Ligand binder design. Structure first.
Ligand SMILES: OC[C@H]1O[C@H](O)[C@H](O)[C@@H](O)[C@@H]1O
Ligand SMILES: OC[C@H]1O[C@H](O)[C@H](O)[C@@H](O)[C@@H]1O
Ligand SMILES: OC[C@H]1O[C@H](O)[C@H](O)[C@@H](O)[C@@H]1O
Ligand SMILES: OC[C@H]1O[C@H](O)[C@H](O)[C@@H](O)[C@@H]1O
Ligand SMILES: [Mn+2]
Ligand SMILES: [Mn+2]
Ligand SMILES: [Mn+2]
Ligand SMILES: [Mn+2]
Ligand SMILES: [Mn+2]
Ligand SMILES: [Mn+2]
Ligand SMILES: [Mn+2]
Ligand SMILES: [Mn+2]
Lengths: 388, 388, 388, 388
């Protein structure tokens, strides 16, 4: 009873994840820097499907065009050698001091122009390497104080940036879509578009909404105390789940980025249940940090437990949905009735229906139990492999 | 130096606010029930502009059509006697046991039909009394466990309900718009459409989006640790701030509904600054609970401090924006540059602009301070009336 | 592979738990009131060991001494008929309006005297029924605003109340100990002694500290975002874990009181691991609310899943600690070294030890990985019954 | 109406505060390193009383004994030149990789011995420079996973470390006391002794409790959603407020360390009210980070606003307590009765007092309002300088 990943499971990892040297706000690095080509090789051996990158993970900031080409060639050789793909890429608009007040919504106009040029350069590279999704995380877009940022003007600037990027892609004829990744705070006191809902809403105001979706992250919605499976369900309902970041988080605090399955384990179960039953077919991407307590052996153990926990939860969610006793419980709780239209008969028929109001027996309806606790204990028993 | 409300300030109160008897999850009522006509008279004397109501606040659940007409006539006489208006109304789809699994997204279809009929009956009354906004708070729409609610099916049911309501209003030719009020949790373990962003996003999928906006509440966004002024700015940017609920909240915990100005006082300052500078012209509605420690004298004192604190903050925000020294600080922090287009010259010009990349001096730009702390201390000094 | 409780597992339930009628801040009761004798009989059939009570759960507030004796006689007959015990009792100092500003720390002196008399009356009854622990939950002790409560004076009043109760018990020669139950907020805006640490600290200032310990609750420490197993470890270290309340909670929000095992499932695992390895021998008490969605069938299903989840977690924690591979991992992570004294050789020897400073190789020590992620994945695999 | 600090106000600053270069988990430094002698001179000009330091702030890690003496001599000259004092010192047991699993509670014994030697070396220096308080912040003492740390063994190790430090000080005859600074999380997933209450409780188990108190920090208790003034009141009640860290925090999230007065402004008001009315006489120490958006002008502006906001709040709290109308309101709310003993007449008299139970009119007592909202609005009006 083991749980071995293959490239067909579509598991991906950012370079910055296994590559995190362990520098935190209070401490120095505990691990040496990893060569991207070493991470590609090590992740391939563990059964991953591919890797993702920020521009600056792959090509050191300020590299000359000759060093750039060299970094890319070595990387490309490692992909060729391993069969690893690059399904997603993104921009670092957060590390360099120039970005201390944001990239696309910096108060300084010149910075905002530079942010766009830096992004466009990396869209070209991403396309070259075969990425289908381009992620935007505006971790520096926000404020620590109320007068520093007019948020209406800042959303104008953010719309302008994303519209220019959509013009660029369509003008180049690229097959690439954008995914906005929300986070509510950290490193800014408050970040703009802080949740999946705020990002979904914003997208509907862009000039070409069909080019944009979301890249939600488990731990970021949980930093606002929100139900991650519920947020993903809304993104799926809107047709905007382009990509996803998988990890774990213990409640409302700094962004922990624990390996997937740590943190809120029942939420991880209901997330896998949803992705698998909705048939999500994008990458299963891990955005996690091996704790700085670990050496490189602990790094690869942590990355392997990401994949393992996904597969165990997949098996338990599938057993849950396949169990006849669960299917009967779902009927008992009227999940079947939730899926039926309230009033396919139309408004006028509803208005004329005395059984909907005038003659509706509200006490009899009130008295019916929902049988949710029995259903939830079956879900617990399935998760724990304790079906008796 | 006093701060007296008049009806022209557009201050409104729910019947359920000053009428809260003080029943909490752990204790009995501490105050007797108020007659709606007494609350109308007492609020008029304090300088309020109008009141709002749930159906069941005004007409006892299960009232006959004769008792109904009587309740409404007495109410209407009190409005006539005082000049009070009714700008907003809403439905109770949360108290009665029949609603224990939701109204519009209850698993039982019959309940969902009943929820719609109950709502439509009250839209007619609201129109009769002159309301312009109809609020929907789905406090029972959600779940305590993951298998109880398929959230894609539940959003289908929620869309269906709101589309039927928009069909009704347009068929009747009513001048009334809908406002969805988000809350992240309580009384359900997780509530659907938990934040302003999730509600804005959902609205874009309705058949007639122009009929729907949001009614955000200070304390509800703060129950997710979010920046309320930032959420309001996004609602204003989308053109969807139809109504607002004003109160206070101390951080992430149960819904406190303190009087406005209690809770996060700096957030209240930045909220008033925004509403006044954006020229919001709807009601300034208070959804608050006088603490159950209070007798009726404490009730009216609490309601009066709601209005007082709004007026004091209005004065301090106006003094802030009018101060030449603040105007200079805003320029120093490049708020003027945030309001200018990043690239009105267009994409091609941006791509050809060497000063945006090839020759952009990133260290010089990085070195410029934002001068945000000096700006924020001027804002503090203005709030505290300590300008030296 | 089933998990059947017997009275020997020491599982107990408050009357108020299965008896909760489902009244919440926003809704009416969904269930009829249960007779205490029915709950005793139903819990006995499920395998419970005993029940606990507030005074007012058992004897209706304001009962005459004749009704009192009658309520107690019927109760006592049900205990005799079932073999159920009563290991713990407590006082309701929170429901009645008189307690709206607290019991022991109400500003009104007369209320504080009444709170003490009401408590003492119930200590006598508790002793009569064989309780060994008397719990105090000061849910009304606190404030919504800063000037309402001088907290130094309020701690004086709280000390005075607990000292008088300790004088009473010792004067009567009773064998009963007190346990303070912390909660950080709700129903008061902030509650005094909000966490296990604050209660432990307070106890050290009482006249007879040996009479007092803590009754921590899973969901209450999690309402402050704290690690419940860590808080219990500190209570065990102090010798003050007199009693415990078991339930589940999804993060920082209102007090959910979900059945045990819901909420934070990994925390529940580490809690059971600790209680079992420290050999806690008190009651395993459930303070939970069957969700108001449920009818009485759902009530008893929820109570049975409390016990079931405890037993499953007990089995998985025991398998974890017994696994040789885990024992090797614990050594790899130097848990054995944590249990050894840092400096049993004494201060002077430490000062003279050059290998502790002058010649300590800090880079070699820094380079050693802690191997925590491999250990934590073994714990995950054990929890999920996925050991491969 | 200005608010100028002098050395007599006892305002102090850590070297690491104005010296923070702005490195965060996601970005590089935005400011150059400050010489400690420059910070001493600049803080003296702003009206500060003194500075505090970690060992490694003052003497670069790994410095030779000759460089050490040089660093100290230059520092000492700057103190002499300015009249600045050093009232507090502390140890860095968090930055160096060797401390990745803790200092005093690292699993590796050798690390724990090294942590103690490093600490003792700095106690000698602190004494030399005149510090009266030695702070311990165990930011690396904790865990990200449940099996990594046995918390009973870890509290044994923590007790052992603090007892050895108390033996050292008493053996040397030093006049220095210890203050433990709690924090609930960050950089560890959970930190041991996470709140003021947990630290107070732990202290009572040390061999010489009179040597130890707490150094609470505004933003750290707020990272658990707790009421900071209430926690300080308990520390004052226990006689353990040895030192305090002043700053601001917006709710439950990463540790922001905003300047004092930012964050929760009403909490800052009630804190100053308490410190001033209890007559706290230790340093008013600021542990804050000027946001990384700022240049050095913004650094000194931020440090000056710390002091300014303290003085403005001091004035408003003093005006509040001195107002006759407030004094009358406090009586109306029975704050005077809270300060009187509940039962100075003793237990037996209480038991015999029929007016305390048998003849206590609970409805009349319940009906009395507490008049807390009127009191709290007077406090608001005083804070805002809006007394009408
Ligand atoms: O978008 C790219 C990634 O950028 C940064 O590494 C963020 O911390 C991570 O959350 C995000 O996914
Ligand atoms: O929508 C109507 C109102 O309904 C209920 O009273 C809710 O608690 C309140 O938040 C909401 O504003
Ligand atoms: O102390 C007795 C019990 O009293 C109340 O029911 C509280 O809600 C519960 O937390 C507590 O355990
Ligand atoms: O104890 C010394 C100081 O050490 C570190 O700088 C901590 O971040 C700060 O909170 C603490 O006060
Ligand atoms: Mn993250
Ligand atoms: Mn991410
Ligand atoms: Mn509310
Ligand atoms: Mn509301
Ligand atoms: Mn509880
Ligand atoms: Mn409890
Ligand atoms: Mn801090
Ligand atoms: Mn500090």
């Amino acid at each position: 009873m083991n749980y071995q990943p293959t490239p067909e499971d579509r598991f991906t990892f950012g370079l910055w994840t296994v590559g995190w040297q362990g520098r935190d706000p209070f401490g120095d690095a505990t691990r040496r820097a990893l060569d991207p080509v070493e991470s590609v090789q090590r992740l391939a051996e563990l059964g991953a499907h591919g890797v993702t990158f920020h521009d600056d993970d792959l090509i050191p900031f300020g590299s000359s065009d000759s060093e750039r080409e060299e970094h890319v060639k070595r990387f490309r050789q490692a992909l060729d050698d391993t069969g690893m793909k690059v399904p997603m890429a993104t921009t670092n608009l957060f590390t360099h001091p120039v970005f201390k007040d944001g990239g696309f919504t910096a108060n300084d106009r010149d910075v905002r122009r530079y942010a766009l040029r830096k992004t466009i350069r990396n869209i070209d590279l991403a396309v070259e390497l075969g990425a289908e999704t381009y992620v935007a995380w505006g971790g520096r877009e926000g404020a620590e104080s109320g007068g520093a940022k007019d948020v209406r003007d800042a959303l104008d600037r953010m719309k302008e940036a994303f519209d220019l990027l959509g013009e660029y892609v369509t003008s180049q004829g690229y097959d690439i879509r954008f995914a906005i990744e929300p986070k509510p705070n950290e490193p800014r006191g408050d970040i703009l578009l802080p949740t999946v809902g705020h990002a979904l809403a914003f997208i509907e105001r862009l000039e070409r909404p069909e080019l944009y979706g979301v890249n939600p992250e488990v731990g970021h919605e949980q930093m606002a105390g929100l139900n991650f499976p519920h947020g993903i369900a809304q993104a799926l309902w809107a047709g905007k789940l382009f990509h996803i970041d998988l990890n774990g988080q213990n409640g409302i605090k700094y962004d922990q980025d624990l390996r997937f399955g740590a943190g809120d384990l029942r939420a991880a179960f209901w997330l896998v249940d949803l992705l698998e039953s909705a048939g999500y077919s994008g990458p299963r991407h891990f955005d996690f940090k091996p704790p700085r307590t670990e050496d490189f052996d602990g790094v690869w153990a942590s990355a392997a437990g990401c994949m393992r926990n996904y597969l165990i939860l997949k098996e338990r969610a599938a057993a849950f949905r396949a169990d006849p006793e669960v299917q009967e419980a779902l009927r008992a709780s009227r999940l079947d009735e939730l899926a039926r239209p309230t009033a396919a008969d139309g408004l006028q028929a509803l208005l004329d229906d005395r059984s909907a109001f005038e003659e509706f027996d509200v006490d009899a309806a009130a008295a019916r139990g929902m049988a949710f606790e029995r259903l939830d204990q079956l879900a617990m028993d399935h998760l724990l492999g304790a079906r008796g």
